[PDB]
Amino acid sequence: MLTRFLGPRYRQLARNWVPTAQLWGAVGAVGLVWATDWRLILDWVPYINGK
Amino acid sequence: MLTRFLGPRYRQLARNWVPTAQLWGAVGAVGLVWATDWRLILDWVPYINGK
Amino acid sequence: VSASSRWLEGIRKWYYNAAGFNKLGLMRDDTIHENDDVKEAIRRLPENLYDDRVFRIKRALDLSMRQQILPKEQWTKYEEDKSYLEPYLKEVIRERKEREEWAKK
Amino acid sequence: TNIRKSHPLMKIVNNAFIDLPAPSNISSWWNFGSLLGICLILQILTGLFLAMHYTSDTTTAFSSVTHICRDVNYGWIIRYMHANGASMFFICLYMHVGRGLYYGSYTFLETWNIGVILLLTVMATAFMGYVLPWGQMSFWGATVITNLLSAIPYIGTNLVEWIWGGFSVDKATLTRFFAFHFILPFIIMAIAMVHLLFLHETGSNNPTGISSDVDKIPFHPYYTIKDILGALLLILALMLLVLFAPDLLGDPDNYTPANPLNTPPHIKPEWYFLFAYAILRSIPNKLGGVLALAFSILILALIPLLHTSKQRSMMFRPLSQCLFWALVADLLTLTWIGGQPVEHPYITIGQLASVLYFLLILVLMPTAGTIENKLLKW
Amino acid sequence: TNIRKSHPLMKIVNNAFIDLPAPSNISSWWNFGSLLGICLILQILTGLFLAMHYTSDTTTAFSSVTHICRDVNYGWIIRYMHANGASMFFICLYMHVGRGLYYGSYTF
Amino acid sequence: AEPEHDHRKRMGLKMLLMMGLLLPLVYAMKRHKWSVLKSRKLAYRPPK
Amino acid sequence: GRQFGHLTRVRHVITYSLSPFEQRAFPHYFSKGIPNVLRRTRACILRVAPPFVAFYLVYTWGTQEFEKSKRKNPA
Amino acid sequence: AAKNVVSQFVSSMSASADVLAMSKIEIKLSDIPEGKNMAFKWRGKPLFV
Amino acid sequence: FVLQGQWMRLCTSATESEVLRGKNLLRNALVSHLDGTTPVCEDIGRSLLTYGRRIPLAEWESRIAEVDARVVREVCSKYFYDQCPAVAGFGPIEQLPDYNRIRSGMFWLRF
Amino acid sequence: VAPTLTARLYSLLFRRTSTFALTIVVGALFFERAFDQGADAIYEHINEGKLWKHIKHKYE
């Protein structure tokens, strides 16, 4: 019954938190990547090619 | 400064709890004796001479 | 109206007897699961109903304790079952949904 | 005034099992919480004594265990109380989760989820427990199961070798499990305290599912003694097993020292996992089976969102009572299947019970609820 | 109102290390309580990892320990953090009992 | 395979004999305390 | 929370009770006892039993089909 | 500093006296007659010839 | 809890000093009560119906006088110690202790 | 004799939690023994598979 959250205001609310939720994903991405020294991802980064 | 507990009433109080404190020692005596099967003590008891 | 209504009604009367709360002297609305809407409606009941409702529930809990049941004579007959709480609950839901509509704008 | 009420320590005890308002209502199905508690300390108590002798290296793993039962004084009752206590623990665990579902106790979101965590935890605890004596089944049951994680894409391999401490179920793999099997029951116990903390916010639910505030009774003397009596019964059950049929619930195959090249034909997990084992092999897919096996226990956490009836308990709802016992029976089928070889009838009937388990929970029970409401004009 | 204050779990945390009224006064000698706490989990954490390798039979007792420092990856820092953590634990312990006596904290 | 065989069965005999005495005994203890709730009678006396 | 004195509101209900040292612990234990249990059994058989026999039938059959599938006659 | 310690503790569960890993096994073929599956031990794992 | 605590205490440990207070209280109550014609006439009438005699103050004093601590803890024990109460509750009694617990408070484990 | 039994038992030994305890501990002593006699005597009577073996093999 998630219809309670369906309306104009809720839609404005979602847009307002978008940049924040996006940036929070940027943090989690780099966060995992750096913490596991992601071979796959890190190779693209200049200066972090310690091989 | 245990003088606060020194007087007639306190003396009556001690006498009143004497039979109780005595009986509570009887319980602890037999209690240890039976629980450790006290060789030393139990030998005197008729019927508990399992040797 | 005809055979049709009676059939559904008798299917309903059958489940009712099978549900079996009436054996504990309870009423349909006594068994309602208490949530926010329900708590408020219980709160809005007038003195008499609220009192009766508590005694009914007490009679039942007491029975359900010794796992006995009421004599057949005193079970609560379908028909005779008062939906005392319904109108209150409906209004409590109807109130909430208004806030909820207002919250969308 | 009264010390029991105001001393910072006793307060707890008092408000937890002395003055706590309890329904006059709760029946035998409510005893399992205390029995689970008793099972816990029992596993901790005997388990400890077993650790004062058991040695955790492949060389003496099996040996030490034998040393325990023959040389160590009464090491045998201890050993058997331990083994059987684990089973008793699972019986009560399943009974407890049973009561919760039937009676709608799961409406207590937090209390129940802590319980799911209690479930996985005691489960994870026992999986490791049985690898310890380093029996054929231990090594092999340890091999079958661990490997399951090797289905997780891109990482199953690395992960399985990581929890293995090598390329196989080696020496690293035994000491590891000893250590965790020692620390897990302590964490279980703390998590069980939070179970109780959260439970105490609402008080207990009851057979009728109707609120009982109107008829509450003090936990002592009623439920201290109703709890005492039911523990004695648990002692009967437990002792009946260790003192008469000690191996009844155990595989004879684990009495043969492990052998990495052997591989028994028989190969099954302990009884308390058979239903889940069934569900797993009923799927002809590596990822599927495992995913499905996970979903099999983690679904206890979906239950509250599937509640549909206007009544909490199932006591007054027969369509659901029927569906409930079908669910029990269907798990009994799953147990049975999982204990049988993956051949003839068993395959397809095992695949049927599986779909059913999920249909019964994910669709049949929710629907029966909506119908029972409709039938009451609710 | 505020979740930190009323959630049955956080209440604890909150009333134990967030809102708890504390003297503006307490000095460095008061740090030993938290350090004792840290020493405890540290001994528990490294201690655990040491138990995933150490074997408890005379035959391999010493051996397993050596196995830890040479073969087990970083088993040496773990082993040494453990050993030294025990000493650190005692230093703080003695410091803590020191503060108590000097400051009369024992009236509790 | 099981040197303990005989010993346990002796305890088992004691376990049944004991439980055959404790079980009813605890029941009666629990019966006696619940007495109060089993025979409680209710009456509802609303005004008017 | 919790505690007696703050649970809920109730009025007009009397409760007569009796000292345990004044009554018997097993009044009509079998007299009223057994009738009740039958009644409770009756009340629940149709809801509890059916799934269990359904398992039972599938159990014994499934077993027979297994055993009898592992033999061959002609061919 | 956090990863380092965490990694070092993570690493503590992998390598060891465990790069036995393995060989080049030499098996006499005239010992396995037609139709038989002979299993040997190689890299801690069963090897079928 | 407190009321029961006192009965128990008196049953098991009445001190001597307090018994003199209680005695004094009674002598003062008796004599203070037998003041004015009405109370006295009522005492004559009731006493004859219940004692068959009229008990002279001098005798009640004698009876009071005879009580000392031992008597108190003896006599209180006979009627209070481990006996079943008759309990009557009216009002907002949600917290009136359960009978079992009221009954348990009629004896104590130290004694 | 019958009512006064449970009665006297209460009178002289049950009120005071003291005696009540003094008796159960003392009562546990005699009981533990008398139970182990009868119990073992029972275990023997249903068996006789060991012990009388001794009268045979040794006696020196």
Ligand code: HEM
């Ligand atoms: C570590 C094993 C567990 C222990 C020691 C434990 C302990 C307890 C205790 C002492 C109670 C008191 C009331 C009663 O038993 O009914 C209780 C009730 C409850 N437990 Fe558990 N529990 C455990 C596992 C579970 C599991 C597996 C679940 C479900 C996933 C669960 C969810 C509940 C719920 C919902 C209740 C409320 C029951 C009601 O009031 O009807 N707990 N538990």
Ligand code: HEM
């Ligand atoms: C922290 C307390 C515990 C300790 C110290 C402990 C330690 C041990 C040890 C050393 C063994 C191997 C010796 C043997 O098999 O007899 C073992 C076996 C086992 N224990 Fe525990 N454990 C504890 C808690 C548990 C818990 C919570 C469970 C789960 C109910 C559990 C279930 C098992 C199982 C399944 C086995 C292997 C089966 C067997 O007995 O042969 N124990 N435990």
